Each structure stands twice: as structure tokens, then as C-alpha cells.
């Protein structure tokens, strides 16, 4: 039983998941004076098929938009990778108020939310289940979301939430290309890290975009109005779901720019 409350939250996760104190934990604070530019990093290349969009689900602590992952219709390539990675999900993290909510921070600056677009290594592994615990198994793009003007690209996502208000509800979510949510520039930082919540596997190559995307105060309010309880129980809004940043433990954050 993990969550984001005071008793089951990030600071207690290590009791059930000792890897929470590991050497490749995420998120991290990116100190830009300590990043190392790497001339070998190629540009990020995403090519997603909107027909792979499948379902939106309320998972209690968050909501997920999942994608069909039976073939290479929707892939991420380039950057630090020599393998192609298959899209399987995107989701967001947010905080209790606008002042925080992102997971990664840049030079100590906290943003209001963060988008995660997750992929698994289909060149090397046969399924997400096999890839999920492998050091080279997962690739996640993180986009920092800065509070400001309403972001119209979020519209379909936001409009879908009324059908998945409570824990366990799910609905079709089709014909959507999440590359439309990415910033204009794909300049990025990369470092070896982990899932940011249990099971916290140290299996993620992180791709953190330099450019933020916008989100309005009211759009964030829609996230926070999702309910963590099951239908019929007392309503418990999903106020936050961002993990604090974790020690780099000697890792190097590389920059593509
Ligand atoms: N971008 S991220 O915030 O680091 C991120 C991306 C993907 C997954 C998670 N963590 C969870 O889903 N934890 C709950 C278990 N749900 C089942 C399950 C699904 C996928 C994977 Br892989 C492992 C796994 O056990 C975090
Ligand atoms: Zn995430």
C-alpha cells in the first residue's frame, strides 16, 4: 500500500521498496553548470501512430493513457539510443498548488506539472513485463509544464477525465498522437534513472526536454479534481503525485545542446 500521503508516501517507500534508496533513483535536480555536453547524442526522433491510442484509466494516484504496443507503429529513436523504443503510455504528475508539481527540477526550480511519455525496448525484449526491470528496458520523455496560458493540445485529455472520475474507471481513448504534446524544440538532458514511484525499478533512460510546455491554473485544477476513491465512497481529490528529487550519487546528466 503505497501512495503520496504522509503515511504511505515517498519518504516511507523504502520500507517496502528498498531500491528507493538506490544509486539510480529519479527524479533528480538538473544542475546546468554540472551537465556535460555530449557530441555523440543524436536528435530525438518520435514517430507515433494515432491509431495506437487505446484507453484512459484512473489508477487512484494518477491517470494513464495507454497505447497498443503489439508492433512498432509508435516508436522513439535517436538521442542516446541505438535501439528503437515502443510507446506504451503517457501520464502527468502535479502538485497541491501551482508552486510545485513537477518531478524533475532544473537548477532548483520547481514547475507546476510534468508530462511523462513512456516507452519500452522492443529491440531487445519481447514485452513491457520483460523490459520493465532491465537497465536498458525503458525510455521516458519528461516535459516540464510551466503554469501560464491554457494549452489547447491538452483538450482531448482534459475532456476525457469526466468519464474516469473515480478509481478504477476506464474508457476508450482513441486517435491521438501524443507527440503533439511535446515542445517545439527537442533539445534534451539525459541520465540513467528509475521509475519515479513503486516499484521504482532502475530501468529508465530519462530524456528531459529543455523547453517547457504551458498549462493553465484551471487545467491543473482539472487534474486535482480527479478522485482517488472508488465510486460511492467519500470523495478524495488527487491533490498531488510528484516524488521529491533524489541524490545523483555520482551520475552524470548529459546535454544534447
Ligand atoms: N514515467 S514514470 O513516473 O517513472 C513510470 C512509468 C511507468 C510506470 C511507472 N510506475 C508504475 O506504474 N507503478 C505501479 C505499478 N503498475 C504496474 C507497472 C506498470 C509499468 C511498469 Br514499467 C512497471 C509496473 O509495475 C512509473
Ligand atoms: Zn511519471
Amino acid at each position: 500500500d503505497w501512495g503520496y500521503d504522509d503515511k504511505n508516501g515517498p519518504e516511507q517507500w523504502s520500507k517496502l521498496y528498498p531500491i528507493a534508496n538506490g544509486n539510480n533513483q529519479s527524479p533528480v535536480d538538473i544542475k546546468t553548470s554540472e551537465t556535460k555536453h555530449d557530441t555523440s547524442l543524436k536528435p530525438i526522433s518520435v514517430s507515433y501512430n494515432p491509431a495506437t491510442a487505446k484507453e484512459i484509466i484512473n489508477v487512484g494516484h494518477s491517470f494513464h493513457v495507454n497505447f497498443e504496443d503489439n508492433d512498432n507503429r509508435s516508436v522513439l529513436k535517436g538521442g542516446p539510443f541505438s535501439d528503437s523504443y515502443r510507446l506504451f503510455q503517457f501520464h502527468f504528475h502535479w502538485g497541491s498548488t501551482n508552486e510545485h508539481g513537477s518531478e524533475h527540477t532544473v537548477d532548483g526550480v520547481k514547475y507546476s506539472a510534468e508530462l511523462h511519455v513512456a516507452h519500452w525496448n522492443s529491440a531487445k525484449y519481447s514485452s513491457l513485463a520483460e523490459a520493465a526491470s532491465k537497465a536498458d528496458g525503458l525510455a521516458v520523455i519528461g516535459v516540464l509544464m510551466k503554469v501560464g496560458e491554457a494549452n489547447p493540445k491538452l483538450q482531448k485529455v482534459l475532456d476525457a477525465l469526466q468519464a474516469i472520475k473515480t478509481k478504477g474507471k476506464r474508457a476508450p481513448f482513441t486517435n491521438f498522437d501524443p507527440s503533439t504534446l511535446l515542445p517545439s524544440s527537442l533539445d534534451f538532458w539525459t541520465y540513467p534513472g528509475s521509475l519515479t514511484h513503486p516499484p521504482l525499478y532502475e530501468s529508465v533512460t530519462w530524456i528531459i526536454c529543455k523547453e517547457s510546455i504551458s498549462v493553465s491554473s484551471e487545467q491543473l485544477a482539472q487534474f486535482r479534481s480527479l478522485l482517488s476513491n472508488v465510486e460511492g465512497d467519500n470523495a478524495v481529490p488527487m491533490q498531488h503525485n510528484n516524488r521529491p528529487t533524489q541524490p545523483l550519487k555520482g551520475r552524470t546528466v548529459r546535454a544534447s545542446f
Side-chain angles (χ1 to χ4, degrees), residues 2-5 7-15 17-257:
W2 68 270
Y4 295 93
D5 301 316
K7 182 173 294 202
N8 65 5
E11 289 302 320
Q12 307 314 318
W13 284 348
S14 74
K15 295 190 275 195
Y17 306 89
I19 202 60
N21 290 316
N23 292 340
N24 299 89
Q25 285 296 289
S26 288
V28 299
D29 177 54
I30 298 173
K31 292 171 180 47
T32 57
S33 67
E34 305 226 63
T35 60
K36 75 151 190 111
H37 174 79
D38 191 334
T39 71
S40 71
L41 290 171
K42 304 178 122 201
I44 286 304
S45 148
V46 293
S47 176
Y48 301 149
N49 189 322
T52 59
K54 195 205 308 214
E55 187 172 49
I56 190 170
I57 294 169
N58 180 325
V59 302
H61 58 94
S62 195
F63 71 97
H64 290 169
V65 177
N66 290 317
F67 289 73
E68 300 184 6
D69 68 341
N70 51 286
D71 63 15
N72 277 340
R73 277 172 300 161
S74 289
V75 292
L76 159 66
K77 302 195 285 225
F81 304 117
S82 58
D83 300 327
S84 171
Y85 288 71
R86 186 174 299 178
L87 174 65
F88 72 98
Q89 180 187 103
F90 76 85
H91 66 255
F92 304 85
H93 303 258
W94 60 86
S96 323
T97 69
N98 292 354
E99 309 309 300
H100 58 289
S102 75
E103 297 210 293
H104 293 88
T105 58
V106 181
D107 294 313
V109 179
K110 308 185 293 304
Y111 293 89
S112 293
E114 186 169 328
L115 160 70
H116 289 162
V117 188
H119 313 72
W120 63 267
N121 191 334
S122 60
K124 292 194 52 172
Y125 311 115
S126 303
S127 71
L128 172 64
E130 178 185 8
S133 63
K134 305 286 181 296
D136 58 358
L138 304 178
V140 185
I141 304 172
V143 185
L144 295 158
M145 299 174 60
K146 178 178 193 298
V147 68
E149 299 165 10
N151 187 335
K153 313 271 203 53
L154 298 176
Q155 196 58 51
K156 182 190 175 78
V157 170
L158 295 168
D159 285 352
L161 298 188
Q162 44 69 42
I164 58 148
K165 271 299 197 167
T166 49
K167 182 173 167 53
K169 284 197 79 178
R170 64 205 62 216
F173 189 92
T174 58
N175 193 30
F176 184 74
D177 176 355
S179 75
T180 60
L181 297 173
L182 297 183
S184 306
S185 161
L186 301 180
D187 286 353
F188 66 92
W189 296 290
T190 184
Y191 74 99
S194 76
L195 305 175
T196 67
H197 38 107
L200 299 163
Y201 292 146
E202 303 186 324
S203 55
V204 179
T205 302
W206 279 97
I207 303 292
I208 308 306
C209 288
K210 186 198 63 179
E211 188 182 314
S212 64
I213 64 174
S214 87
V215 62
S216 74
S217 302
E218 295 74 39
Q219 289 180 317
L220 293 164
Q222 291 188 256
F223 291 162
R224 303 190 198 103
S225 73
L226 282 168
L227 301 179
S228 63
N229 56 284
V230 304
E231 179 168 314
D233 285 359
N234 298 324
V236 181
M238 284 187 206
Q239 290 208 243
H240 56 100
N241 55 18
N242 60 317
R243 188 190 192 189
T245 53
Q246 303 300 312
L248 264 184
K249 302 272 192 113
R251 290 172 281 175
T252 307
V253 179
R254 292 180 284 161
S256 76
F257 60 96

